[PDB]
Ligand binder design. Structure first.
Ligand SMILES: [Mg+2]
Ligand SMILES: [Mg+2]
Ligand SMILES: [Mg+2]
Ligand SMILES: [Mg+2]
Ligand SMILES: [Mg+2]
Ligand SMILES: [Mg+2]
Ligand SMILES: [Mg+2]
Ligand SMILES: [Mg+2]
Ligand SMILES: [Mg+2]
Ligand SMILES: [Mg+2]
Ligand SMILES: [Mg+2]
Ligand SMILES: [Mg+2]
Ligand SMILES: [Mg+2]
Ligand SMILES: [Mg+2]
Ligand SMILES: [Mg+2]
Ligand SMILES: [Mg+2]
Ligand SMILES: [Mg+2]
Ligand SMILES: [Mg+2]
Ligand SMILES: [Mg+2]
Ligand SMILES: [Mg+2]
Ligand SMILES: [Mg+2]
Ligand SMILES: [Mg+2]
Ligand SMILES: [Mg+2]
Ligand SMILES: [Mg+2]
Ligand SMILES: [Mg+2]
Ligand SMILES: [Mg+2]
Ligand SMILES: [Mg+2]
Ligand SMILES: [Mg+2]
Ligand SMILES: [Mg+2]
Ligand SMILES: [Mg+2]
Ligand SMILES: [Mg+2]
Ligand SMILES: [Mg+2]
Ligand SMILES: [Mg+2]
Ligand SMILES: [Mg+2]
Ligand SMILES: [Mg+2]
Ligand SMILES: [Mg+2]
Ligand SMILES: [Mg+2]
Ligand SMILES: [Mg+2]
Ligand SMILES: [Mg+2]
Ligand SMILES: [Mg+2]
Ligand SMILES: [Mg+2]
Ligand SMILES: [Mg+2]
Ligand SMILES: [Mg+2]
Ligand SMILES: [Mg+2]
Ligand SMILES: [Mg+2]
Ligand SMILES: [Mg+2]
Ligand SMILES: [Mg+2]
Ligand SMILES: [Mg+2]
Ligand SMILES: [Mg+2]
Ligand SMILES: [Mg+2]
Ligand SMILES: [Mg+2]
Ligand SMILES: [Mg+2]
Ligand SMILES: [Mg+2]
Ligand SMILES: [Mg+2]
Ligand SMILES: [Mg+2]
Ligand SMILES: [Mg+2]
Lengths: 259, 158, 134
RNA sequence: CGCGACCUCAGAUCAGACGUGGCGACCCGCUGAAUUUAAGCAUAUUAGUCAGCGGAGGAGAAGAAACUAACCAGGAUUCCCUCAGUAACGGCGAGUGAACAGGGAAGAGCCCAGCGCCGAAUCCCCGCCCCGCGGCGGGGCGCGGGACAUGUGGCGUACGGAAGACCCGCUCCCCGGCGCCGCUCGUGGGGGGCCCAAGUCCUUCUGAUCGAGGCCCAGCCCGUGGACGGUGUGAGGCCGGUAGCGGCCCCCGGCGCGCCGGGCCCGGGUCUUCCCGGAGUCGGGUUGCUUGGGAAUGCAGCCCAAAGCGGGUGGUAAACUCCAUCUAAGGCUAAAUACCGGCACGAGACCGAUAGUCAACAAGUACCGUAAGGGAAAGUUGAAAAGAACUUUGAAGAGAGAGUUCAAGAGGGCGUGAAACCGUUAAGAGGUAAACGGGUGGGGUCCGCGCAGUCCGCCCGGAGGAUUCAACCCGGCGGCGGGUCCGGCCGUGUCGGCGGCCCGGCGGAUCUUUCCCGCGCGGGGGACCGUCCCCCGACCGGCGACCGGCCGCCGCCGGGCGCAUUUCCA
RNA sequence: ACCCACCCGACCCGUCUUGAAACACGGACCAAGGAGUCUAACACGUGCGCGAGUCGGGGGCUCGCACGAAAGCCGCCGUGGCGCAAUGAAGGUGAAGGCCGGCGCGCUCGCCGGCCGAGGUGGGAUCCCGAGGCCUCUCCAGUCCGCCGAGGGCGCACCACCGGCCCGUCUCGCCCGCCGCGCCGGGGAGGUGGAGCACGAGCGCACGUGUUAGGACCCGAAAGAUGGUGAACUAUGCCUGGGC
RNA sequence: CGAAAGACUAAUCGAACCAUCUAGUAGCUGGUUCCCUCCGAAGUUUCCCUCAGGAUAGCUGGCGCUCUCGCACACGCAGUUU
RNA sequence: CCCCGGAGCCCCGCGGACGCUACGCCGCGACGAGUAGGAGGGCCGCUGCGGUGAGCCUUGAAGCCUAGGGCGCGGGCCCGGGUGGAGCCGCCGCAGGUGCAGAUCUUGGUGGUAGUAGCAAAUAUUCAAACGAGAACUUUGAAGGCCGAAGUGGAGAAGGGUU
RNA sequence: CGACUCUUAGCGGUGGAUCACUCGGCUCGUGCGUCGAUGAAGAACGCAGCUAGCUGCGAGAAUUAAUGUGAAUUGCAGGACACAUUGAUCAUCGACACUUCGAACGCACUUGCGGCCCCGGGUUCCUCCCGGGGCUACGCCUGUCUGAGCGUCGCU
């Protein structure tokens, strides 16, 4: 809010003794606005309590590693059909979930081609859903150039734009990513981890070069390996009905002794 | 009023500091502006090094920095004289020249001389007209490169 | 999307642009499509509408297959008045009802020299665009 | 007693130039408080801050060391990070508070006076011609004036310079014009103009659709175009646009080639002989202000008042001494940097008409005040005015019918139309002001019923009707699980190949300059070590990591099975 | 839940206050507005990343930014910050000890070889060993599996204590060293000051609470300062008119 | 300015009005916006140009941690008493 | 002295909830005042953003009203009817100019007071006609009165600014 | 039952909350970065067929010219135009024009007084009179002309 906003008046308080209320009141004149109330946040005209400043700490900074961790997690869970499906992507008829494609897809220079591809890969019900989602945003956004809203579609990670990003552009929903420059705001939209992606062999091969395997450094991000795991066997059912464990338990007391 | 243990601290917000707050919402647009300007200069100075001129190897002052070595401001006059480069001309071939640098030790001198020698060797002087006179390099070493040198010319590595 | 970073995409600015548009710009805005008969002939989608074009109203109450001549173009009101598109006021007098040009289709153009040249230019740029695509 | 030089001064509506005011976000120069903090207050602080005055520009100011340092030393200014809330200041309290080095952004360096040499070799103004003329310029020609020796111009300025002799190597740089060629990065520089894809397709809602279903692949068509706006609701395809190294047309810029007019005989090293620096300034005292600067950081007034192997600085006063380091008292200079004013644009996790600017509107308006100054309220009929013809009552305002509209239960301050408050209609009550909590009762309002609500669901027994199968095999398909790990793919730990090791790369302060290349160093090989990959055999976790056969089981389909089975129905 | 009846209960809220139904103040009624914010600095708690490191700025390289003023990357990856070392006003100095054998007279002092290598006491979650049971449908043999386990051990973290080391400081004392033998330098023993060491725990980010500096929860003075406008009222002088 | 009343100086005078510094400062009045759940005070200490205020102890809450054993197999502590 | 793909089961070690959102579900005890103050949980509530509901919406969104039906301890919420006429919500995260009875609070509106106080300074009015929808008040006529030339008369200055 | 009062609901008023809109703000960013004696900013007064205000303009006054555009403008009139023609209307704006104050410039602020040159009526340069035109601020620079001084000299 503006610095002056509210304080442009010259308003002294009529002191106590005149009935009224010890507010600063607009000085003199034969107007409505005379002996009114200025400055106090409560007053009409007034001045908001603690005016918003420009130098609020708007931007926020994050450790590099943590961002890289985030983006590994997000990539990791673009596999796992459960998580992708739970993020809403209609990935019922898709052939193989880390969906990698031929690199003529770099070639394509027309939406027509890009759409036909999506229909071949059975990803088109995602775009078809995005089309259905298109609707008017509720509320004051409408009058601030956020008037329409819709789904997020399939991500498409490409290794080099040889034309692709023109072809996938009008197709509503689709975001395109360079592999070299991944983004967590796009791979995990809403801070939500699943998201259906469509890789290109050239790009998909480059991931191990970018992020490094577990016994090889990044070899692209100077000094970086994947984050280590805190536990390896994540399915605990297999653990809990193993021979080794159940051999060494007390037998379960499960009678219910009511009052 | 202080309360049970802390740093007895003195913030400097007793002047009208909010009148003189300098925000940084520029910086992106600034960085872009700088990089655009930089790209323009590179295009103007066509096959020249974008970097600028070649600059001398120099030791840092004080016991602290002492062991390190930097780029300096420009080659001293004694150094140019030894290399056989006329001081007025050096500036026209892309050699920085200050004339405020003394020259105490012989060790610093000779290394800087070696620099100018090296530079002269690996430099491609275009002739003033396309019709070639003396000094100006052959049309072979010309077609093969009218190339810029990205990054600092002959970089210093301590 | 729109990429050109000197255009606007901003409700208030595009609305201001519209309602405060000057006559010669409002000409352009108040264009209307040609019939599929004329489209085929001239290789032109649409034309600025004009005082005495023949016209069919397409949508609304007056939506019909009658081909009325345009009577006048009220560029201040962004509207055109059409021969028999009219409604009786309380006291018997007829009043020309406004139709917005975009909800109208031109069947017969009023061909002067200038209009002809506009049609020739539009058809040319179309054909250049088709040749570029091929 | 004249006439003539100059010197200093006047006057001109003399000829021709300039300055004057504004704006003021940012910038330069002064001036300069007090609220305030210190829990009082006077030094301090607020603060060299607000107010005051002056002067600018697109930036300003600053700037090419009388600098830092004390190192193996750096090397104009400005800006950012850091130094650092540090050294320091301070009723050593409150509080204040820099710099150097280091890393970046940028980067650019120069000119005089003097000392000297050159016939003032220089400048301004007249007047005539040729070109050029909307930033008054070039060339020529004039015994045409003046400025200038109380010093103009060339060379030259501390990085040294000048003048000489011979060592070397050879000779393009500038401007006034006139043309002409390639339209010269948001991917054709800048500006202007005019252009460029696809549904108004079928049904159906609606006052009106941009809606709902459909349309050779979620449906048709375009999609380098599904930004936005408009259009009687929600529109990629109705219109404007949007996309595009898309088009055309103008104009202008900027650079490339040719011709002319002029200017311009413009080097370097080597040895010799000469040449060299800004005074009422520095410096000292001082008083006042200022600074982190403390026996004086800076700036001032006054008084004193220099030197020339001098002078300045070297963060504790002074003397002696060595070192280091600059060269002051003249000047110019782009760049990174600033920008709540201006012009022109773009955007927003902002506000949404008591908000957001005082101001969405005929707002610095109306209005007030002698004046300085103060300073409002105030957005919305409807898609379209279709804004109520006509009849009738009334002096009229107002009504009653009629009509428009999807609607006036939208009628010109008219969207929605809350509360307080009021009118009326209906119901109920009423001498302890009302209202309230707990508990019942009476009456109302609607709501669920029932014209039996006897509520369903299994299983069973019976008596009636009903089609087809379960059971059983046969043929096919699919799935599960299994071990023989049987056969093969798959991968963990180990061992063998030293096999990838050079046909496996990176890393290393491990080594070698027997190597190579470039100049003891750099780059590359070559050894070495660490790490990552092939070959097959063996053992083992045989791991959801899979295939193939075989087995067993399950399911589905299709065959057969006609009725003590089989479901159905009451 | 609308109204009405009756019995019982029942004073008007907000607020300062030892004490409010108060003859204490604010409040006719309704609508909308209306007060713990943001920045910086510290502290402790918590979550995440990395860990003797950590770090991101500032800058740079990648785009016309549609979404981007993002995202990504950088021998800049670390100039640098904080941390990894203290202590002294300072010049400065700067965290190891033990054992064994030998040589100097073992002189609780000086010098030379070998071995162990962050000391010890108590208490310590917890691990480890475990006599012995306790049965099995018989009399004994007898490996396997438990359950308990008396008794004994290694003992995290942490606490208490005692030793030790470093820096300041004192007291007392005896020896070493060499290019410079000196108003040189170096040690020892015993006290005593230190925000110390004694096999590390930080750095970055985020959230919370608290405390400050800022308009600083909101509203409130009497004042103070700077720069301007007024003698049309009124005060007094003067000029020129009028009146009694 | 005052034949003096601190009178008058544009309804204002023991220091006019207007704008700014200014959201001046307040140990002092007033106010400070939803629900449930659990815990739950103090008006005493020393110091203070302190006595309508702070500081410091106390009393409160929150976060915890280290252990203990009703898992036939307990040590320590107390507004008692002996 | 035999196998649960079959002991038939009060215990079943061969496989295991109707139960198991393990931030779930279940069982036993004990306890429950509270200002200032602290803490926890809110499928309490407001506005906007990233996600997400093949959400809702002219076959009627928001808002508003309701002697309609319900839920929740409560903050609140959901349904029916009406009105209205264009947008709006659930869930997961993020963000805040986020919740009012008070402040002699601010702005706007409305009551009771109340058809009340009041429309009392300076002697004074009456009759007729006209116009006119309409006359206590206009106009004309008649009568009675006042101002009583230091005027309630006739002219100017300043000030007003078309009166 | 009666009136009045209280409560609740329906409808109607009053009032303008809420909701929904938004040619306005606020904030952040980009590019350029331009006023004035050749008369600025500001002020005044004027100008429309009917026009008060806002806006736009300057006695050529809701604009002239030109260029681009290509049929309107529209509240009503009236008109023009041949919209097969420099051509309606807008936009651009390079030509032209731009009342009076204002740094404000003949001197004064009444809108008052002037001086000096040229031109038309007036004369027949007769000055008057009237009308028109052009000059008539301060400061300062270079030159120019006229000058001043028992300033410093020379020759006579
Ligand atoms: Mg406001
Ligand atoms: Mg809403
Ligand atoms: Mg650079
Ligand atoms: Mg000026
Ligand atoms: Mg004080
Ligand atoms: Mg105080
Ligand atoms: Mg005081
Ligand atoms: Mg100061
Ligand atoms: Mg100022
Ligand atoms: Mg400058
Ligand atoms: Mg200088
Ligand atoms: Mg410096
Ligand atoms: Mg620090
Ligand atoms: Mg200070
Ligand atoms: Mg000279
Ligand atoms: Mg629309
Ligand atoms: Mg659209
Ligand atoms: Mg189109
Ligand atoms: Mg000071
Ligand atoms: Mg000293
Ligand atoms: Mg300068
Ligand atoms: Mg309003
Ligand atoms: Mg309003
Ligand atoms: Mg407003
Ligand atoms: Mg409103
Ligand atoms: Mg209003
Ligand atoms: Mg309204
Ligand atoms: Mg409204
Ligand atoms: Mg309606
Ligand atoms: Mg309506
Ligand atoms: Mg509305
Ligand atoms: Mg209404
Ligand atoms: Mg009522
Ligand atoms: Mg009644
Ligand atoms: Mg009370
Ligand atoms: Mg009492
Ligand atoms: Mg009181
Ligand atoms: Mg009261
Ligand atoms: Mg409110
Ligand atoms: Mg922490
Ligand atoms: Mg604390
Ligand atoms: Mg605060
Ligand atoms: Mg105040
Ligand atoms: Mg004072
Ligand atoms: Mg007195
Ligand atoms: Mg306040
Ligand atoms: Mg007090
Ligand atoms: Mg009190
Ligand atoms: Mg309780
Ligand atoms: Mg509407
Ligand atoms: Mg907000
Ligand atoms: Mg209220
Ligand atoms: Mg009465
Ligand atoms: Mg009398
Ligand atoms: Mg009269
Ligand atoms: Mg009179």
């Amino acid at each position: 809010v503006s610095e002056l906003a509210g304080h442009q008046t010259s308003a002294e308080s009529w002191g106590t003794g005149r009935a009224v209320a010890r507010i600063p009141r607009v000085r003199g004149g034969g107007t409505h606005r005379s002996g009114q109330g200025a400055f106090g946040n409560m007053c009409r005209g007034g001045r908001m309590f603690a005016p918003t400043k420009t130098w609020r700490r708007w931007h926020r900074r994050v450790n590099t590693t943590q961002k890289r961790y985030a983006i590994c997690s997000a990539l990791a869970a673009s596999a796992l059909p459960a998580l992708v499906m739970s993020k809403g992507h209609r990935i019922e008829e898709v052939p193989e979930l880390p969906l990698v494609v031929e690199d003529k897809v770099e070639g394509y220079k027309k939406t027509k081609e890009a759409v036909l591809l999506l229909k071949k890969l059975k990803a088109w019900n995602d775009i078809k859903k995005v089309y259905a989602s298109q609707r008017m945003r509720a509320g004051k956004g409408k009058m601030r150039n956020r008037r329409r809203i819709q789904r997020r579609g399939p991500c498409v990670i490409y290794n080099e734009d040889n034309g692709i990003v023109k072809a996938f552009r009008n197709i509503p929903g689709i975001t395109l990513l360079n592999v070299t420059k991944l983004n967590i705001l796009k791979l995990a939209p809403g801070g939500h981890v699943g998201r259906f992606c469509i890789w290109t062999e050239s790009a998909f091969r480059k991931l191990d070069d970018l992020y490094g395997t577990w016994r090889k450094a990044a070899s692209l991000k100077s000094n970086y390996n994947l984050p280590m795991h805190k536990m390896l066997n994540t399915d605990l059912s297999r653990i809990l009905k193993s021979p080794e464990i159940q051999r060494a338990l007390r037998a379960p007391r499960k009678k219910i002794h009511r009052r | 009023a202080p309360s049970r243990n802390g740093m007895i601290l003195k913030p400097h917000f007793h002047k009208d500091w909010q009148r003189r707050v300098a925000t940084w919402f520029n910086q992106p647009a600034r960085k872009i502006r700088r990089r655009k300007a930089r790209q323009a200069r590179a295009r103007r100075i066509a096959p020249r090094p974008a970097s600028g001129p070649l600059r001398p190897i120099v030791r840092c002052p004080t016991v602290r920095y002492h062991t390190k070595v930097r780029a300096g401001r420009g080659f001293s006059l004694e150094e140019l004289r030894v290399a056989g480069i006329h001081k007025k001309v050096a500036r026209t071939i892309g050699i920085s020249v200050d004339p405020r640098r003394r020259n105490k030790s012989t060790e610093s001198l000779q290394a800087n001389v070696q620099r100018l020698k090296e530079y002269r060797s690996k430099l491609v002087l275009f002739p003033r007209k396309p019709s070639a006179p003396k000094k100006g390099d052959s049309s072979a070493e010309e077609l093969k490169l009218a190339t810029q040198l990205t990054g600092p010319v002959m970089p210093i590595r301590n | 999307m729109k990429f050109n970073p000197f255009v606007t995409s901003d409700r208030s600015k595009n609305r201001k642009r519209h309602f405060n548009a000057p006559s010669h710009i409002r000409r352009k805005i108040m264009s209307s499509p040609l019939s599929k008969e004329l489209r085929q002939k001239y290789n032109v989608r649409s034309m600025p509408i004009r005082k005495d074009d023949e016209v069919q109203v397409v949508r609304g109450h007056y939506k019909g297959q009658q081909i009325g001549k345009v009577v006048q173009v009220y560029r201040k009101k962004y509207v055109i008045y059409i021969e028999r598109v009219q409604r009786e006021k309380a006291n018997g007098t007829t009043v020309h009802v406004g139709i917005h040009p975009s909800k109208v289709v031109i069947t017969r153009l009023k061909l002067d020299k200038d209009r002809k040249k506009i049609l020739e230019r539009k058809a040319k740029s179309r054909q250049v665009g088709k040749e570029k695509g091929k």
